[PDB]
Design a protein around this ligand. Structure first.
Ligand SMILES: O=C(NCc1ccc(S(=O)(=O)N2CCCCC2)cc1)c1cc2cnccc2[nH]1
Ligand SMILES: O=C(NCc1ccc(S(=O)(=O)N2CCCCC2)cc1)c1cc2cnccc2[nH]1
Lengths: 473, 473
C-alpha cells in the first residue's frame, strides 16, 4: 500500500531540523517558470494527485513505524520526525493539515504565473508543506503532456483551416500511440488522460479508467479508437501473402474504419500495386463512415507521406476542394504514426501544404513523442517557498542565484488575477490583499484532508479549448 | 484494480480476427535493435512486470465484463474477444497460457540480441502472445535507465581511477535526485530501482520498497542517503541570514555527512566568505566520516564546479594525492546536481582532470537526466513476431521495410548462445536446434501463470558489474 511518509525525496526527511526555530508557517507555490515556444500552459492533473495520494487518512501507526524502520537503515541514523507524524495521526486522524489553492483545471495560463499554492494549517506542521513538494511537482507531467498536445492541436488547426476551410474532425487528428513507449502503467494512464484534454483519439486504454475515476465525463468514455492491423497480423501470413492479409483484414472490418499498416516489406508497392490495383475494388466500395486508413510506418516521415499521397492520387479519384487543395476520395485516408513529435508534425503539414495536399487526408499517431519525450525542464515546472512566519512575523522569501536570474523565485503571499486587458498577472508580497485587481483566481481545492473543489473532465476540456475553436463558435 | 484486459493498445483488441485462419502459435521476441554508443544493454525489470501484472489469476468474470463494457463504448461497436478471455478463465482458472524465456536479469548483452521470447502454450490462445506486447515492452524503461546509469558509472570509474588510482566510493558517485522529475510514482520506483543496479545512492525512496518486494537484498536496504538542505531551508531564514542557516544546519548535523545547497543568492560568496571564512571553524573540526558537502545548483555546470573548487582550494588545506591531483581535506566535498546527464557528467570530470582536480572531490546528482530524459528509441527496444504455426506448419516471419533496413526483424525461432570466442550470438530460424553452438542461454522465467525463475537484486548487481570492477577484484 502507498505510504505518504515514504513518498518524498530522502533529504526532506531531515528538513524539520533545518527551518528557523519558531516557524509556524511555510507557504510555497508552483509555477511553470518563465525562461529568457511554450508561452502558455494547460493546468491539469492536480485533482488526480489530491484524490489518489493526499486525501483522507494517509497516516497510520503502521505507516509511521514502517517509515521509521526504513529511514533508520537508509540514513544509517535515526533522523525522522516521528513526533511530527504522530501529531497528525492523533490530532487530525491522520488527515494532512494542509491547504492547497489552485487555478481551475483546464485553464490556459501564460508562463511565470502561480498555478497553485500550499501551506500548513497548523503551526506544528510547518515542515509538511515541503514534504509533499515531491509528489505535487509530479503534476509537471500531465501539465506538460496536455500543453504539448494542445500546441500540436494549434498546428493541426491552423493547417486544417487553411487547406480545407474548416476544423471538422480536428479532435481526431492526433492519436495517442504511446502506451508501450512510456515508463509505467501509471504514467500511461496519466499521460493518456492529459492528451484527451485536447483530442478524442487514443489507443492508451489506461487513460479511460483514470478519467472515469478522478474526473468524469457525461459521455460513456472520453476517448475512442477503431480496428487496425499491426505488423504481426500482416507478417503472420508469410512474405508472399501480404495481399491475402490485407484482403482478409479489410473484409473482416468492411463496415467500420480500419487502418492497415502497409510498410512491412515495401510501402510503395503496397500502395500502388496491392491497394491501388489488386484490391482496389474492395476499397472504392467502402462507406464514407468506414474508410480504409493506410499506415506507412518507416522512412523519412515527410518524404514518405508525400510519396504515399502521390501514389494514391494516381490510383484513386482525387478531387480539388474549394480551397484548391487535393483531396482523396472519402473511403481512403492516411495515418502517419512513426517519428511524430511536435516538430515533425509541423514539418509534415507544411510539406503537405506546399504540395497542395489537404490536411483532411491525413491523421497523425504519436507515441513516445506525445507521452515520454518530455521533461520537467520543458516548462520549468517548479515548486518554491515564498513566505514563512517566524516568531509571529511574516517574511517574504525567495532564491535568486547570481549566475542564473531565470531561477529567481517569487516573493511573499501570491494571488492570480485578470488584468484590465483580460490577461493574467501574479501579485506578490500579499499585494492581492489591496483588492486593486479583482478576485483571486486560485480556489481552495484541498483543505485538512478533504478535496474541497473538483472539476469534471468536460469542464477541463471546455477551459482548454483553442481560441480558433472559440472563434469558430 | 489492475485489469490485464484493459492493459493493451486498443487496436490489439481487434487482432484475434486478423491472423491467418487456423493459427495455433504466435511466437515473438524482444531485442534492443542494433543501429555509436550504447553498444551493450543491461537486461533488467522483466521480473517486476511478471510478478506485478502477469502471474496468477489475472482474469475474472468481473474483469471480462468490465472490458466488454469499456470496449463497446471505446470502439462504438462490439469487437472484444469475450469468448477467448472466457476460455482462459474456464480452462486455466484465469492463468495466462504463455511461456516466456529470458536472459538473466542484470546480464550485459550487446545490441541486436534476443533478450526474451513469448509464445502461447494453448493453440486457442494464439492471440494472447501479442496482446501482452504493450505491457512487456515497458521493460524498455528499466533496461534503459539501468544501461544509461551503467554507462555513467563507466565514465566515473575511468576518471576516478585515473585521478586517484582506485575506485573507492565509486558506487556513491552518482546519486538519484529524480523523484519529482519523473512522470509518476510507479515510474519513480521502477527507475530508481534500475539506477540502484549500478549505484547505492538514492533520494527516490520509492525504489527501496520495489526492490524489497520484487527482488530482495541481503542488506536491509539497497540504497542510502544523508541529511541535506534544500533552498527552502536556507531561504526561510531570510536573505540577510544565510550564514545563520548554514551554521544551524551543520551544527544540527555535526556528526554525520551533510550537504548544504549554497547558491541561493551567491554561490561564490557562500564558498569564499561564509564557508571559507565566517564558518570555517565549524567545517575544519568535522570528521572524515561526517564531511560537509557543498552543493552548487546553478550556472554553467563545469565552470561553476571549477570555480567552486578553486575557491575552496584557497580557503582550505589542499593536498596532492599520489597521482598528482589536488584533493580537498576529507571533511569537505562537493556535489553537482544541476544539469547533470551522461554528456555533462563527461564534460565535468574531463574538465576537472584538465585542471588537476581529483574526482575524489566530487559526486553528482542527476534527476530528470537519470530517470526521465530517456525514450524507447535510445536502445530501440522492440517486440516482434518471428514465428507462427498455421495449419500445422511453422512459418518464419519478419518485417523488412524497404526504406529502413534498421527496422528489419529476426526470423523464426530464436536462441541465444556463446560463440567460440565467448561472445553472444542470436541464432535465427531454429538453428539453435542444430546444436553447433551449445545450449540456449535463455531461461524459462514464466509459464502458464507461474514465475519459474527469478533473481535477487544481489545477483543482478553482480551480473551488471563493470569489467574494471571485475578486474580490480
Ligand atoms: O492504428 C492504430 N490504432 C487505430 C487507429 C486507426 C486510425 C486512426 S485515425 O486517426 O486515422 N482515425 C480516427 C477517427 C476515425 C477515422 C480514423 C486512429 C486510430 C494503432 C497504430 C499503433 C501503433 N503503435 C501503437 C498503437 C497503435 N494503434
Ligand atoms: O542533497 C541531497 N541528498 C542528500 C545527499 C547529499 C550528498 C550526497 S553525496 O553523493 O555527496 N554523498 C554520498 C556518500 C556520503 C558522502 C556524500 C548524496 C546524497 C539532495 C539534493 C536534491 C535535489 N533534488 C532532489 C533531491 C535531492 N536530494
Amino acid at each position: 500500500e502507498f505510504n505518504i511518509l515514504l513518498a518524498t525525496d530522502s533529504y526532506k526527511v531531515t528538513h524539520y531540523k533545518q527551518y528557523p526555530p519558531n516557524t509556524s508557517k511555510v507557504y510555497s507555490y508552483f509555477e511553470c517558470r518563465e525562461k529568457k515556444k511554450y508561452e502558455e500552459t494547460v493546468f491539469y492533473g492536480l485533482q488526480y494527485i489530491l484524490n489518489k495520494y493526499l486525501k483522507g487518512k494517509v497516516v497510520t501507526k503502521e505507516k509511521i513505524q514502517e517509515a521509521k524502520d526504513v529511514y533508520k537503515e537508509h540514513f544509517q541514523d535515526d533522523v525522522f520526525n516521528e513526533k511530527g507524524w504522530n501529531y497528525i495521526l492523533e490530532k487530525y486522524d491522520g488527515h494532512l493539515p494542509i491547504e492547497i489553492k489552485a487555478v481551475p483545471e483546464g485553464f490556459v495560463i501564460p508562463r511565470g504565473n502561480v498555478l497553485f499554492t500550499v501551506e500548513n494549517t497548523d503551526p506544528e506542521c510547518y515542515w509538511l508543506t515541503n514534504w509533499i513538494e515531491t509528489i505535487l511537482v509530479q503534476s509537471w507531467y500531465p501539465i506538460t503532456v496536455a500543453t504539448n498536445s494542445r500546441e500540436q492541436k494549434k498546428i493541426l488547426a491552423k493547417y486544417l483551416l487553411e487547406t480545407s476551410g474548416n476544423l471538422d474532425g480536428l479532435e481526431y487528428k492526433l492519436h495517442d500511440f504511446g502506451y508501450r513507449g512510456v515508463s509505467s502503467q501509471e504514467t500511461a494512464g496519466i499521460g493518456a488522460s492529459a492528451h484527451l484534454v485536447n483530442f478524442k483519439g487514443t489507443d492508451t486504454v489506461a487513460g479511460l479508467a483514470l478519467i472515469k475515476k478522478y474526473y468524469g465525463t457525461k459521455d460513456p468514455v472520453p476517448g475512442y479508437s477503431v480496428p487496425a492491423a499491426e505488423h504481426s497480423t500482416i507478417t503472420a501470413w508469410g512474405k508472399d501473402h501480404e495481399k491475402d492479409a490485407f484482403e482478409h483484414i479489410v473484409t473482416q472490418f468492411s463496415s467500420v474504419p480500419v487502418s492497415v499498416v502497409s510498410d512491412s516489406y515495401d510501402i510503395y508497392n503496397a500502395c500502388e500495386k496491392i491497394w491501388g490495383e489488386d484490391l482496389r475494388h474492395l476499397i472504392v466500395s467502402r462507406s464514407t463512415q468506414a474508410p480504409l486508413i493506410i499506415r506507412p510506418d518507416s522512412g523519412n516521415p515527410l518524404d514518405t507521406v508525400l510519396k504515399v499521397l502521390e501514389i494514391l492520387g494516381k490510383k484513386f479519384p482525387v478531387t480539388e476542394n474549394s480551397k484548391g487543395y487535393k483531396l482523396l476520395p472519402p473511403y481512403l485516408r492516411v495515418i502517419q504514426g512513426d517519428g511524430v513529435d511536435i516538430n515533425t508534425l509541423q514539418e509534415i503539414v507544411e510539406g503537405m501544404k506546399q504540395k497542395m495536399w489537404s490536411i483532411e487526408n491525413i491523421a497523425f499517431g504519436s507515441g513516445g513523442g506525445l507521452l515520454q519525450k518530455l521533461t520537467r525542464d520543458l516548462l520549468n515546472c517548479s515548486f518554491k517557498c515564498s513566505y514563512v512566519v517566524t516568531n509571529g512575523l511574516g517574511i517574504n522569501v525567495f532564491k535568486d542565484p547570481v549566475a542564473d536570474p531565470n531561477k529567481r523565485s517569487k516573493k511573499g503571499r501570491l494571488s492570480l488575477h485578470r488584468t484590465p486587458a483580460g490577461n493574467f498577472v501574479t501579485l506578490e508580497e500579499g499585494k492581492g490583499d489591496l483588492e486593486e485587481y479583482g478576485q483571486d483566481l486560485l480556489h481552495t481545492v484541498f483543505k485538512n484532508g478533504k478535496v474541497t473543489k473538483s472539476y469534471s473532465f468536460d469542464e477541463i476540456r471546455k477551459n482548454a479549448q483553442l481560441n480558433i475553436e472559440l472563434e469558430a463558435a
